[PDB]
Design a protein around this ligand. Structure first.
Ligand SMILES: COc1cc2c(cc1OC)CC(=O)N(C)C=C2
Length: 111
């Protein structure tokens, strides 16, 4: 019942959550718990938090009307990481690796 393009998006999402990518995907599995991590400035700096569990809920609830809306949330999640963290931080290295997985497979969108 997902559109053909949203089926491809759901496939990508499943891959980002799969064991294959867990070594660098794990920081993006759930909403950043700023208080738990001691990041008491996180919500002053990041106005629109996003994470893969939220993307999954939105896909299941048919919130995304097209691939573009799905991709905007996945890229918002990476952008938040690049905005908050210094560019040489291990969490940013993990973001760059998972975004490479995302962008190369998003590029294979059926049309
Ligand atoms: C433990 O290292 C961190 C984990 C996380 C964050 C920062 C960290 O170290 C500075 C915040 C973040 O951007 N994301 C995606 C999730 C977890």
């Amino acid at each position: 019942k997902l559109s053909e393009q949203l089926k491809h998006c759901n496939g990508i999402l499943k891959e980002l959550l799969s064991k294959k990518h867990a070594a660098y995907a794990w920081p993006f599995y759930k909403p950043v718990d700023a208080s738990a991590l001691g990041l008491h400035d996180y919500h002053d700096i990041i106005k629109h938090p996003m994470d893969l569990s939220t993307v999954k809920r939105k896909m299941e609830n048919r919130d995304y009307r097209d691939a573009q809306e799905f991709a905007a949330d996945v890229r918002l999640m990476f952008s938040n990481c690049y905005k908050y963290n210094p560019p040489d931080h291990d969490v940013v290295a993990m973001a760059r690796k998972l975004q490479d997985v995302f962008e190369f497979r998003y590029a294979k969108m059926p049309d």
